[PDB]
Each structure stands twice: as C-alpha cells, then as structure tokens.
Tab-separated table of N, CA and C and ligand atoms in Angstrom:
chain	number	residue	atom	x	y	z
S	4	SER	N	76.021	104.444	111.853
S	4	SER	CA	75.102	103.967	110.828
S	4	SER	C	75.858	103.420	109.622
S	5	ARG	N	75.869	102.097	109.493
S	5	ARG	CA	76.504	101.435	108.364
S	5	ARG	C	75.779	100.122	108.109
S	6	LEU	N	76.011	99.557	106.929
S	6	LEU	CA	75.346	98.336	106.499
S	6	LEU	C	76.320	97.166	106.514
S	7	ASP	N	75.803	95.983	106.838
S	7	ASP	CA	76.617	94.776	106.816
S	7	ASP	C	77.121	94.509	105.403
S	8	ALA	N	78.427	94.256	105.285
S	8	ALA	CA	79.042	94.090	103.971
S	8	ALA	C	78.448	92.903	103.223
S	9	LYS	N	78.093	91.837	103.947
S	9	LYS	CA	77.484	90.677	103.305
S	9	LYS	C	76.163	91.038	102.637
S	10	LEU	N	75.459	92.039	103.167
S	10	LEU	CA	74.231	92.509	102.537
S	10	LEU	C	74.531	93.414	101.349
S	11	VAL	N	75.487	94.333	101.510
S	11	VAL	CA	75.834	95.258	100.434
S	11	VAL	C	76.308	94.503	99.200
S	12	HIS	N	76.985	93.372	99.394
S	12	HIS	CA	77.550	92.601	98.295
S	12	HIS	C	76.501	91.846	97.486
S	13	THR	N	75.235	91.856	97.906
S	13	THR	CA	74.170	91.251	97.119
S	13	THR	C	73.473	92.249	96.202
S	14	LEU	N	73.784	93.539	96.331
S	14	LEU	CA	73.203	94.546	95.459
S	14	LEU	C	73.556	94.252	94.001
S	15	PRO	N	72.681	94.616	93.064
S	15	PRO	CA	72.960	94.342	91.650
S	15	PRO	C	74.214	95.062	91.179
S	16	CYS	N	74.997	94.370	90.355
S	16	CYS	CA	76.218	94.926	89.795
S	16	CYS	C	76.301	94.577	88.317
S	17	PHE	N	76.988	95.431	87.562
S	17	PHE	CA	77.094	95.269	86.120
S	17	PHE	C	78.365	95.954	85.636
S	18	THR	N	78.741	95.651	84.395
S	18	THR	CA	79.946	96.190	83.777
S	18	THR	C	79.585	97.354	82.861
S	19	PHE	N	80.398	98.410	82.902
S	19	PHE	CA	80.165	99.592	82.072
S	19	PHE	C	80.549	99.274	80.632
S	20	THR	N	79.555	98.945	79.814
S	20	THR	CA	79.738	98.671	78.396
S	20	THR	C	78.816	99.574	77.581
S	21	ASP	N	78.758	99.313	76.270
S	21	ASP	CA	77.896	100.100	75.393
S	21	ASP	C	76.439	100.027	75.832
S	22	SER	N	76.011	98.863	76.322
S	22	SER	CA	74.627	98.699	76.755
S	22	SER	C	74.342	99.512	78.012
S	23	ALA	N	75.207	99.403	79.020
S	23	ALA	CA	74.991	100.128	80.267
S	23	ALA	C	75.325	101.611	80.148
S	24	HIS	N	76.009	102.014	79.072
S	24	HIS	CA	76.577	103.356	78.957
S	24	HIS	C	75.565	104.443	79.307
S	25	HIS	N	74.440	104.468	78.600
S	25	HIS	CA	73.483	105.560	78.718
S	25	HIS	C	72.342	105.254	79.680
S	26	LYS	N	72.427	104.153	80.424
S	26	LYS	CA	71.561	103.929	81.574
S	26	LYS	C	72.230	104.371	82.868
S	27	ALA	N	73.519	104.061	83.022
S	27	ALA	CA	74.223	104.352	84.264
S	27	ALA	C	74.656	105.808	84.361
S	28	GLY	N	74.855	106.473	83.235
S	28	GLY	CA	75.385	107.820	83.233
S	28	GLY	C	76.868	107.839	82.910
S	29	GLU	N	77.461	109.015	83.102
S	29	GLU	CA	78.827	109.268	82.663
S	29	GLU	C	79.853	109.242	83.787
S	30	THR	N	79.467	109.586	85.014
S	30	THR	CA	80.438	109.852	86.064
S	30	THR	C	79.965	109.277	87.390
S	31	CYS	N	80.909	108.749	88.165
S	31	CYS	CA	80.634	108.309	89.527
S	31	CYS	C	80.665	109.514	90.461
S	32	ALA	N	79.563	109.743	91.180
S	32	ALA	CA	79.469	110.904	92.061
S	32	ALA	C	80.354	110.781	93.294
S	33	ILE	N	80.796	109.570	93.634
S	33	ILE	CA	81.564	109.372	94.859
S	33	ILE	C	83.027	109.753	94.657
S	34	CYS	N	83.591	109.447	93.488
S	34	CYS	CA	84.988	109.749	93.206
S	34	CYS	C	85.178	110.791	92.111
S	35	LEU	N	84.107	111.188	91.420
S	35	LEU	CA	84.079	112.217	90.380
S	35	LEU	C	84.796	111.804	89.101
S	36	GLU	N	85.215	110.547	88.984
S	36	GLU	CA	85.866	110.064	87.775
S	36	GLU	C	84.825	109.565	86.780
S	37	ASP	N	85.043	109.866	85.503
S	37	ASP	CA	84.167	109.351	84.460
S	37	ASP	C	84.338	107.844	84.329
S	38	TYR	N	83.221	107.141	84.155
S	38	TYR	CA	83.281	105.696	83.976
S	38	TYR	C	84.101	105.345	82.740
S	39	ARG	N	84.885	104.279	82.852
S	39	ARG	CA	85.665	103.754	81.742
S	39	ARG	C	85.111	102.397	81.327
S	40	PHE	N	85.292	102.068	80.050
S	40	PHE	CA	84.788	100.809	79.515
S	40	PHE	C	85.354	99.628	80.294
S	41	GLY	N	84.469	98.736	80.731
S	41	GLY	CA	84.866	97.546	81.449
S	41	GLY	C	84.846	97.665	82.956
S	42	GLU	N	84.611	98.856	83.499
S	42	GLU	CA	84.577	99.012	84.942
S	42	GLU	C	83.345	98.334	85.533
S	43	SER	N	83.437	98.021	86.821
S	43	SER	CA	82.360	97.374	87.557
S	43	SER	C	81.551	98.420	88.310
S	44	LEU	N	80.235	98.388	88.130
S	44	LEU	CA	79.331	99.331	88.767
S	44	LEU	C	78.305	98.587	89.611
S	45	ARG	N	77.678	99.321	90.526
S	45	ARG	CA	76.565	98.811	91.309
S	45	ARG	C	75.383	99.759	91.194
S	46	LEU	N	74.186	99.206	91.357
S	46	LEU	CA	72.948	99.964	91.269
S	46	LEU	C	72.227	99.932	92.609
S	47	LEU	N	71.782	101.098	93.062
S	47	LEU	CA	70.966	101.253	94.254
S	47	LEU	C	69.492	101.303	93.876
S	48	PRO	N	68.592	100.942	94.795
S	48	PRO	CA	67.161	100.907	94.442
S	48	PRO	C	66.592	102.255	94.042
S	49	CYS	N	67.230	103.357	94.430
S	49	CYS	CA	66.784	104.690	94.044
S	49	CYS	C	67.154	105.045	92.610
S	50	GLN	N	67.783	104.116	91.879
S	50	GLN	CA	68.136	104.215	90.460
S	50	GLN	C	69.407	105.020	90.208
S	51	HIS	N	70.273	105.170	91.207
S	51	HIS	CA	71.583	105.785	91.024
S	51	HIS	C	72.661	104.711	91.043
S	52	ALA	N	73.604	104.812	90.111
S	52	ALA	CA	74.675	103.839	89.977
S	52	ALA	C	76.019	104.470	90.317
S	53	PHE	N	76.945	103.624	90.759
S	53	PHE	CA	78.269	104.075	91.158
S	53	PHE	C	79.289	103.014	90.786
S	54	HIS	N	80.563	103.393	90.857
S	54	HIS	CA	81.629	102.404	90.922
S	54	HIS	C	81.333	101.429	92.055
S	55	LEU	N	81.481	100.133	91.770
S	55	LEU	CA	81.195	99.115	92.778
S	55	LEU	C	82.030	99.336	94.036
S	56	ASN	N	83.334	99.573	93.870
S	56	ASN	CA	84.202	99.786	95.024
S	56	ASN	C	83.842	101.065	95.770
S	57	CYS	N	83.379	102.089	95.050
S	57	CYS	CA	83.077	103.365	95.692
S	57	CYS	C	81.845	103.259	96.584
S	58	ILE	N	80.753	102.696	96.061
S	58	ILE	CA	79.519	102.625	96.838
S	58	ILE	C	79.633	101.586	97.947
S	59	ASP	N	80.387	100.506	97.717
S	59	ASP	CA	80.618	99.526	98.774
S	59	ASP	C	81.310	100.172	99.966
S	60	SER	N	82.319	101.000	99.697
S	60	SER	CA	83.013	101.706	100.768
S	60	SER	C	82.066	102.637	101.510
S	61	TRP	N	81.226	103.362	100.769
S	61	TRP	CA	80.326	104.327	101.392
S	61	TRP	C	79.312	103.636	102.295
S	62	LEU	N	78.715	102.547	101.815
S	62	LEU	CA	77.626	101.910	102.547
S	62	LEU	C	78.114	101.092	103.736
S	63	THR	N	79.346	100.583	103.694
S	63	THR	CA	79.844	99.750	104.784
S	63	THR	C	80.590	100.544	105.848
S	64	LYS	N	81.125	101.711	105.499
S	64	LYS	CA	81.959	102.473	106.417
S	64	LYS	C	81.388	103.826	106.815
S	65	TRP	N	80.628	104.485	105.945
S	65	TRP	CA	80.289	105.886	106.162
S	65	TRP	C	78.802	106.156	106.320
S	66	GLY	N	77.937	105.508	105.534
S	66	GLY	CA	76.526	105.835	105.587
S	66	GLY	C	75.627	104.646	105.319
S	67	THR	N	74.322	104.902	105.440
S	67	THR	CA	73.281	103.907	105.217
S	67	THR	C	72.263	104.392	104.191
S	68	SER	N	72.670	105.313	103.323
S	68	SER	CA	71.763	105.878	102.338
S	68	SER	C	72.539	106.173	101.064
S	69	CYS	N	71.800	106.470	100.003
S	69	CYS	CA	72.429	106.853	98.746
S	69	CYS	C	73.135	108.196	98.912
S	70	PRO	N	74.423	108.298	98.545
S	70	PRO	CA	75.135	109.577	98.708
S	70	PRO	C	74.687	110.674	97.750
S	71	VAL	N	73.760	110.399	96.830
S	71	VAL	CA	73.291	111.413	95.890
S	71	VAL	C	71.941	111.955	96.339
S	72	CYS	N	70.967	111.065	96.532
S	72	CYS	CA	69.608	111.469	96.866
S	72	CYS	C	69.221	111.149	98.305
S	73	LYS	N	70.122	110.542	99.082
S	73	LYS	CA	69.922	110.262	100.506
S	73	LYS	C	68.759	109.308	100.766
S	74	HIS	N	68.387	108.503	99.775
S	74	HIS	CA	67.403	107.449	99.989
S	74	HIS	C	67.936	106.445	101.003
S	75	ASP	N	67.227	106.298	102.116
S	75	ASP	CA	67.705	105.478	103.219
S	75	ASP	C	67.458	104.002	102.954
S	76	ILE	N	68.454	103.189	103.284
S	76	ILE	CA	68.393	101.743	103.114
S	76	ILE	C	68.253	101.105	104.487
S	77	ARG	N	67.210	100.292	104.658
S	77	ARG	CA	66.989	99.523	105.884
S	77	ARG	C	66.862	100.440	107.101
S	78	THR	N	65.843	101.297	107.058
S	78	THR	CA	65.486	102.067	108.243
S	78	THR	C	64.888	101.160	109.311
S	79	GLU	N	63.952	100.300	108.919
S	79	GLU	CA	63.403	99.271	109.787
S	79	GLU	C	63.735	97.903	109.209
S	80	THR	N	63.892	96.919	110.090
S	80	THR	CA	64.317	95.585	109.691
S	80	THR	C	63.351	94.543	110.240
S	81	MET	N	63.499	93.322	109.729
S	81	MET	CA	62.714	92.163	110.155
S	81	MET	C	61.218	92.338	109.897
S	82	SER	N	60.881	93.153	108.902
S	82	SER	CA	59.489	93.361	108.523
G	101	ZN	ZN1	79.082	108.986	77.502
G	102	ZN	ZN1	83.764	106.024	91.833
G	103	ZN	ZN1	69.917	107.731	95.050
C-alpha cells in the first residue's frame, strides 16, 4: 500500500514562517524534530502537517494514510 509519487507531489505545501507558525504546529511527528524557520512543509486533508520530505517518504514508500490519525487516502479510485 503506497501512493504514486506524482500524486503525492500535488499535495499543498508551504514554508514554515511566522504566518504558518501557529497553524502547522511546533514539531514534525515523523522525525520528531521541531520545525525551523524556512523549512518546507506539506498539509494532508485531515489537517495534519509535516516536513515535506518526511511525509513524501511515508506516503510513497510506507503507507497510504496519515501517520498521526490514520486517515486513509484513496481507498477507492476513479469515482
Ligand atoms: Zn512555536
Ligand atoms: Zn520531519
Ligand atoms: Zn491526520
């Protein structure tokens, strides 16, 4: 169970700045590192954000759901 990388790369992404600071949270759950100013993040439809590289790795290689709340992505297709 994994997602096509070309699909994962269309997910919304943003930079960790003062504006995104208190919407995205403080720490990436995938690597446990606190976000630093200027880092690249991605947002999942379940409203959890991660390091862009971290969630891309998870969705393309390891799983098909959010690693925090297990919200499944693309259970059924075409539809
Ligand atoms: Zn903070
Ligand atoms: Zn991370
Ligand atoms: Zn989630």
